[PDB]
Amino acid sequence: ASRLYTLVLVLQPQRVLLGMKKRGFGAGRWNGFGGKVQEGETIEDGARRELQEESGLTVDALHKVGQIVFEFVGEPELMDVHVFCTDSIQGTPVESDEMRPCWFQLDQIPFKDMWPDDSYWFPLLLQKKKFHGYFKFQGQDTILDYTLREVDTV
Ligand SMILES: Nc1nc(NC2CC2)cc(N2CCCCC2)n1
Numbered sequence: 056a057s058r059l060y061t062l063v064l065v066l067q068p069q070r071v072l073l074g075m076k077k078r079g080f081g082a083g084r085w086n087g088f089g090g091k092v093q094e095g096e097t098i099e100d101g102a103r104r105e106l107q108e109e110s111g112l113t114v115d116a117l118h119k120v121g122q123i124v125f126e127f128v129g130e131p132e133l134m135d136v137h138v139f140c141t142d143s144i145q146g147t148p149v150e151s152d153e154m155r156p157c158w159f160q161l162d163q164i165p166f167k168d169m170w171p172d173d174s175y176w177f178p179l180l181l182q183k184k185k186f187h188g189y190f191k192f193q194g195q196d197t198i199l200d201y202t203l204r205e206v207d208t209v
Pocket of ligand 1: 061090091192
């Protein structure tokens with residue numbers, strides 16, 4: 056059994072939009088925008104909601120780019136993250152209670168201050184290849200196992 060999560064990456068030709076998480080799960084790490092999927096909304100609905108809540112931004116189209124399943128040692132529920140990207144956004148990203156947004160050149164992505172799995176799967180995101188990932192964490196910082204694959208359908 057897994058819990059659904061969203062992750063939205065605004066990936067333009069020369070830069071990626073990330074947010075510094077100010078509170079809650081993942082505070083202190085840069086990441087794309089997302090969170091738990093609620094009862095009563097589609098996964099993509101929840102993705103749009105978390106983008107708007109955390110950055111003020113809305114988008115015309117979201118594209119499925121990946122799925123990553125996480126196991127945490129001693130935690131019974133797996134976490135199922137659905138990753139989306141978009142290239143065009145509506146509005147200017149602005150700070151919220153959860154996230155401080157900044158653009159990053161693609162050669163200056165802050166991997167040391169991101170989730171450790173990002174350094175593994177971000178290359179596939181940037182080559183615009185669809186992927187399935189699996190990571191076993193011990194705590195929040197230690198990857199014990201992982202698998203990573205490109206897929207034809209996310
Ligand atoms: N890039 C990223 N890496 C993750 N690794 C898991 C914690 C060890 C989770 C995650 N998200 C889950 C919470 C919402 C935002 C997306 N996003």
